[PDB]
């Protein structure tokens, strides 16, 4: 309860954050209004908010934020000519008016792709007007991503500003700024990818699948927290995620702020690692918590076998609260295993459940159910072992080439840029995740593969090319990676028709960027396999000591004509 929600927001966020969030909020609904129009709206909303700060009883200050926002959206003179049926929302009252606006947000829209200006033009633009530069970009990205959570979009903006101060004063601006902008763009695209992923999965897999995921994830985060606490948090985390997926910023904000506040008022019963997060302002609290490192395990933890295998009442305790029992199992397994992926722990829980359903329908039929856990644990642990002792012996590029031949052969119907992008991406996964010790490797792989495979399935959901790729993308979120890891070579594929122009290279290669020369060689590699999928070869680019001049044509046309018969 609050007399002026706008005054309260302005006070808890502060002028600068307030301004940026309103810009983002207005840009996500008014996607086609120019940067200068959104500036004048922000300035008008800001002047209004300050009158409420000076006086909560000032005219219209006691109206809800949803009310004021919809009112401001309906003052837009061009609303009907530009957004069409979005202007029909203004003929409704709250709550129907806000729900109407939410549904008219264009998930696309149709805007030219945002191109990275030259490093020196970015730094000069940033010098002469840091305000206009960053906030025009904040507006440009907000308008193209209307469903991306506004505070998180502001968090990215402050890291970009920080990338621009550290590098635009550096001797070689490009060398500093370019990896940083790549990091930020890939972090933001990962953030956007996993946002739509958990929302789609909530729709398709049901609240129970979400709550299971949450039990496992929270138990790894807070291993000293009791099951009752973890359960309370799973419940609240489930409400926040369902309401956040519906996409009402304000309702999402309040739910996230509430949960963060609860966690922070109950640190002693949750984790000893929340201290800093809990001192942070309201804007950063939830984000900070979502990102905190796993707390340390209590150490005295006995085996699960006593309550989940030996206990006379395994069936009795299970039958009287099937999901709470399975949730306690997951809690107990997950708190002891921050070394596992959440997807793996979920496999152990579904396996345990399958055993209980059969063995409780005989009782002491289970007991050796903890052996039925070893093959599922060994599987992602052995595949991490294999891929990391493949990255070691080859380096990022040579390994991308090793995975490239693989995925090209398995499912050859997928396009050449997609197969290059995915192998290049999984090459980053190996680079990132294999520099972490064995016990931090599965969450790492999981987190990166969940976005690599999400982006992949998103591509295949729009232009399908394989029935097996549809299966892995439409099977359980728990079987997505093992369904993908079980892909065999297409034994019924018809080799691609040779086209000399897609196999001939010119002088441009020596001058094209390091990244661009690689993509060019990697596309030609996807095609070298698309044409010869029966061609034998272990490690392609740089093998050995393990186990597991040039010319356009003339001298250039030699390889096209020679490898034509020197490969089958």
Ligand X SMILES: CCCCCCCCCCCCCC(=O)O
Ligand Y SMILES: CCN(CC)C(=O)COCCOCCNC(=O)COCCOCCNC(=O)CC[C@H](NC(=O)CCCCCCCCCCCCCCCCCCC(=O)O)C(=O)O
Instruction: Kindly list the residues in this chain that would bind ligand Y in the complex (CB under 6 A).
Output: 6, 9, 21-22, 25, 44-45, 48, 51, 59-60, 63, 65, 68-69, 71-72, 150-151, 249, 253, 256-257, 260, 282-283, 285-286
Residue 145 assigned ligand-binding role: no
Residue 254 assigned ligand-binding role: yes
Residue 86 or 526 having the CB closest to ligand X? 526
Residue 48 or 448 having the CB closest to ligand Y? 48
Residue 368 assigned ligand-binding role: no
The interface with ligand X within residues 240-299 (CB under 6 A) comprises 240, 256, 259-260, 263, 286, 289-290
Residue 323 assigned ligand-binding role: no
| Cα 87 off chain centre by | 33
Of the candidates 539, 541, 535, which has an alpha carbon nearest to the alpha carbon of residue 389? 539
**By the rule CB under 6 A, 383 interacts with ligand X:** yes
Rounded Cα–Cα distance for residues 36 and 484 (Å): 47
Residue 246 assigned ligand-binding role: yes
**By the rule CB under 6 A, 89 interacts with ligand X:** no
- Whether residue 344 is preceded by a cis peptide bond, meaning omega within 30 degrees of 0, is no
In the set 39, 42, 61, 477, which binds ligand X (CB under 6 A)? 477
**By the rule CB under 6 A, 469 interacts with ligand X:** yes
- With CB under 5 to 8 Å by kind, the binding choice for 253 among ligand Y, ligand X, none is ligand Y
Residue 5 assigned ligand-binding role: yes
Residue 71 assigned ligand-binding role: no
CA atoms within 13 A on the CB side of 260: 24
Rounded Cα–Cα distance for residues 211 and 241 (Å): 10
What contacts 24+ positions apart, CB below 8 Å, involve 89-97? 94/64, 94/66, 94/67, 94/70, 95/66, 97/70
In the set 2, 116, 432, 506, which binds ligand X (CB under 6 A)? 116
DSSP characters for 378-425?
Answer: HHHHHHHHHHHHHHTTT-HHHHHHHHHHHHHHHSTTS-HHHHHHHHHH
- With CB under 5 to 8 Å by kind, the binding choice for 456 among ligand Y, ligand X, none is ligand X
Where do runs of H (alpha helix) occur along 246-373? Answer: 249-264, 282-290, 305, 314-319, 322-336, 342-359
Residue 248 assigned ligand-binding role: yes
Residue 9 or 347 having the CB closest to ligand Y? 9
Binding region for ligand X (CB under 6 A) out of 11-19, 167-175, 304-312, 481-489: 481-489
- With CB under 5 to 8 Å by kind, the binding choice for 503 among ligand X, ligand Y, none is ligand X
Gaps in the chain following residue numbers (C to N > 2.5 A): 361, 548
Residue with tokens 């030996």: 310
Residue 26 or 325 having the CB closest to ligand Y? 26
**By the rule CB under 6 A, 327 interacts with ligand X:** yes
**By the rule CB under 6 A, 141 interacts with ligand X:** yes
For 551, the token pair is 């010319």
Query: Taking the CA atoms of the chain, what radius of gyration do you get in angstroms?
Result: 27
The interface with ligand X within residues 160-199 (CB under 6 A) comprises 160, 181, 185
Annotated binding site for (4Z,15Z)-bilirubin IXalpha, which residues?
239
């Amino acid at each position: 309860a609050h007399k002026s929600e706008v005054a309260h927001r302005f006070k808890d966020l502060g002028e600068e954050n307030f301004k940026a969030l309103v810009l983002i909020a207005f840009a996500q609904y008014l996607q086609q209004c120019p940067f200068e129009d959104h500036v004048k709206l922000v300035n008008e909303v800001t002047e209004f908010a300050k009158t409420c700060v000076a006086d909560e009883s000032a005219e219209n200050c006691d109206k809800s934020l949803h009310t004021l926002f919809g009112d401001k959206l309906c003052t837009v003179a061009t609303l009907r000519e530009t957004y069409g049926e979005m202007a029909d929302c203004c003929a409704k009252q709250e709550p129907e008016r806000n729900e109407c606006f939410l549904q008219h947000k264009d998930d696309n829209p149709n805007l030219p792709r945002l191109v990275r200006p030259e490093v020196d033009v970015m730094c000069t633009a940033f010098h002469d007007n840091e305000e206009t530069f960053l906030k025009k970009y904040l507006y440009e990205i907000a308008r193209r991503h209307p469903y991306f959570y506004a505070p998180e979009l502001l968090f990215f903006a402050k890291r970009y500003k920080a990338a621009f101060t550290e590098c635009c004063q550096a001797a070689d601006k490009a060398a500093c700024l370019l990896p940083k902008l790549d990091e930020l763009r890939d972090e933001g695209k990962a953030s956007s990818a996993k946002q739509r992923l958990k929302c789609a999965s909530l729709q398709k897999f049901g609240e129970r699948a979400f709550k299971a995921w949450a039990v496992a994830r929270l138990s790894q985060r807070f291993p000293k927290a009791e099951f009752a606490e973890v359960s309370k948090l799973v419940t609240d985390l489930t409400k926040v995620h369902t309401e956040c997926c519906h996409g009402d910023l304000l309702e999402c904000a309040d739910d996230r702020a509430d949960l963060a506040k609860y966690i922070c008022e109950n640190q002693d019963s949750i984790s000893s690692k929340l201290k800093e997060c809990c001192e942070k302002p309201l804007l950063e609290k939830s984000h900070c918590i979502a990102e905190v490192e796993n707390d340390e395990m209590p150490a005295d933890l006995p085996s699960l076998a006593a309550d989940f295998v030996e206990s006379k009442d395994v069936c009795k305790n299970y039958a009287e609260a099937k999901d709470v029992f399975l949730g306690m199992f997951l809690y107990e397994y997950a708190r002891r295993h921050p070394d596992y992926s959440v997807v793996l722990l979920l496999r152990l829980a579904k396996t345990y459940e399958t055993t209980l359903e059969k063995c409780c329908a005989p009782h002491e039929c289970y007991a050796k159910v903890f052996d039925e856990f070893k093959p599922l644990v060994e599987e992602p642990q052995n595949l991490i072992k294999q891929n990391c002792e493949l990255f070691e012996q080859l380096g990022e590029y040579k390994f991308q080439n090793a995975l490239l031949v693989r995925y090209t052969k398995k499912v050859p119907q997928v396009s050449t840029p997609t197969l290059v992008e995915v192998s290049r991406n999984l090459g980053k996964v190996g680079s990132k995740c294999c520099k972490h010790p064995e016990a931090k490797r599965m969450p790492c792989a999981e987190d990166y593969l969940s976005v690599v495979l999400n982006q992949l399935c998103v591509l295949h959901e729009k232009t399908p090319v394989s029935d097996r790729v549809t299966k892995c993308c439409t099977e359980s979120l728990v079987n997505r990676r093992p369904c993908f890891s079980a892909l065999e070579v297409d034994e019924t594929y018809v080799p691609k028709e040779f086209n000399a122009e897609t196999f001939t290279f010119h002088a441009d290669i020596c001058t094209l960027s390091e990244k661009e020369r690689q993509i060019k060689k990697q596309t030609a590699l996807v095609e070298l396999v698309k044409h010869k999928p029966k061609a034998t070869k272990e490690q392609l680019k740089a093998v050995m000591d393990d186990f597991a001049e040039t010319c356009f044509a003339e001298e250039g046309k030699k390889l096209v004509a020679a490898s034509q018969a020197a490969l089958g």
